[PDB]
Amino acid sequence: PIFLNVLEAIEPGVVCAGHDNNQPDSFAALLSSLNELGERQLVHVVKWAKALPGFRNLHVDDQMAVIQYSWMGLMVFAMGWRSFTNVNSRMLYFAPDLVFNEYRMHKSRMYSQCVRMRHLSQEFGWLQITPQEFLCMKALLLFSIIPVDGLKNQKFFDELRMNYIKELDRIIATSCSRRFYQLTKLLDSVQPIARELHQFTFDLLIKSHMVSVDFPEMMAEIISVQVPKILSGKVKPIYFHTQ
Numbered sequence: 001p002i003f004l005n006v007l008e009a010i011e012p013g014v015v016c017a018g019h020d021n022n023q024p025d026s027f028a029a030l031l032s033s034l035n036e037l038g039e040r041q042l043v044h045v046v047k048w049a050k051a052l053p054g055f056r057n058l059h060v061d062d063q064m065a066v067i068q069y070s071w072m073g074l075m076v077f078a079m080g081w082r083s084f085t086n087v088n089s090r091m092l093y094f095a096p097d098l099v100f101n102e103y104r105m106h107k108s109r110m111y112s113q114c115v116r117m118r119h120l121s122q123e124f125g126w127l128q129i130t131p132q133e134f135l136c137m138k139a140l141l142l143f144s145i146i147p148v149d150g151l152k153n154q155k156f157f158d159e160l161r162m163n164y165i166k167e168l169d170r171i172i173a174t175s176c177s178r179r180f181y182q183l184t185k186l187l188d189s190v191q192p193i194a195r196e197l198h199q200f201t202f203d204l205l206i207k208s209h210m211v212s213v214d215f216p217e218m219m220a221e222i223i224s225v226q227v228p229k230i231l232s233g234k235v236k237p238i239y240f241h242t243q
């Protein structure tokens, strides 16, 4: 009741990219649209996270940090879910006005990464993830990447993360054990994907001026300030099982 009531009530609604589907696809136009969509989704991720049960118990500085580190994985996870519920994972449903088909996957120069994300999407089907499990897993996904040196107040974070794990546990509840195993495995699988995208968007930002790919304000900031901390090993994901 209560926990899930909150997660359902705060789930963001549909977000459009504002892409112009009439002009021919192209590396520059597709990625620039994705970046605009990224900026827009970021606004929602922030509002969503701040409304999560117990989130404000975290030190104010830790709050923005965990959101900026988890942003990529969060977007990837929700996207895979939208792709599964809308186009049965046949394509990547980034937004109602920005669906990637085989051709866009290739023209965006993100084919292998898109293949990886499509696999994630398909897993929602293969595992028959319920909407409730999806919401719990997405929440937990927000608390799955932190600085090696710890946050301002690691204790509140560890406590909060532990609670979201217990919540996923209740929703699942020798079948419980098997289900918990496969869902935590799925959650772990998001990280390697998020890392490839972190590397890709970072490289893209550095040469964005040469390829005509625009990066909105807040994203350009996150990719140049928070993402390199992840790429250089200062910030690491928290895996359930050893990789």
Ligand SMILES: C[C@]1(O)CC[C@H]2[C@@H]3CCC4=CC(=O)CCC4=C3C=C[C@@]21C
Residues within 6 Å of the ligand: 031, 034, 035, 037, 038, 041, 075, 076, 078, 079, 093, 094, 095, 197, 200, 201, 204
């Ligand atoms: C194109 C790029 O710069 C590299 C990877 C892209 C990511 C891929 C994951 C993603 C999922 C969504 O549903 C919203 C937009 C979205 C992105 C928008 C811009 C990024 C960060």
